[PDB]
């Protein structure tokens, strides 16, 4: 969406390319075409992807069951 494309259209085609071409196929946002990400060099550390989803789910779960908020009255 940030690059100027429809997000759901891109997602749907990336899902299709997961079995037509391979698991590593995705959408390149620098130039608007689909290609193999690993060969193109568009790769991320697997620690980043692992920690991000784990951290995000932890804070989200904490706020989903939060029952009270205590804060000082601003004068």
How many angstroms separate the CA atoms of 27 and 13, rounded? 9
- Assess 9 for contact with other proteins (CB under 8 A): yes
44 labeled part of a ligand binding site: yes
Binding residue for other proteins (CB under 8 A) from 2, 8, 19, 64? 8
CB of 69 to other proteins, least distance (A): 37
- Assess 52 for contact with other proteins (CB under 8 A): no
- Assess 21 for contact with other proteins (CB under 8 A): no
Q: How many CA atoms lie within 13 A of 44 on its CB side?
A: 8
How many angstroms separate the CA atoms of 16 and 6, rounded? 16
């Amino acid at each position: 969406a940030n690059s100027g494309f429809e997000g759901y259209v891109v997602l749907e085609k990336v899902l299709q390319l997961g079995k037509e071409k391979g698991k590593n196929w995705g959408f390149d946002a620098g130039v608007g075409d689909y290609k193999d990400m690993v060969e193109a060099g568009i790769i991320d550390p697997t620690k980043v992807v692992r920690v991000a989803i784990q951290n995000a789910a932890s804070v989200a779960g904490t706020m989903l069951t939060a029952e009270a908020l205590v804060a000082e009255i601003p004068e």
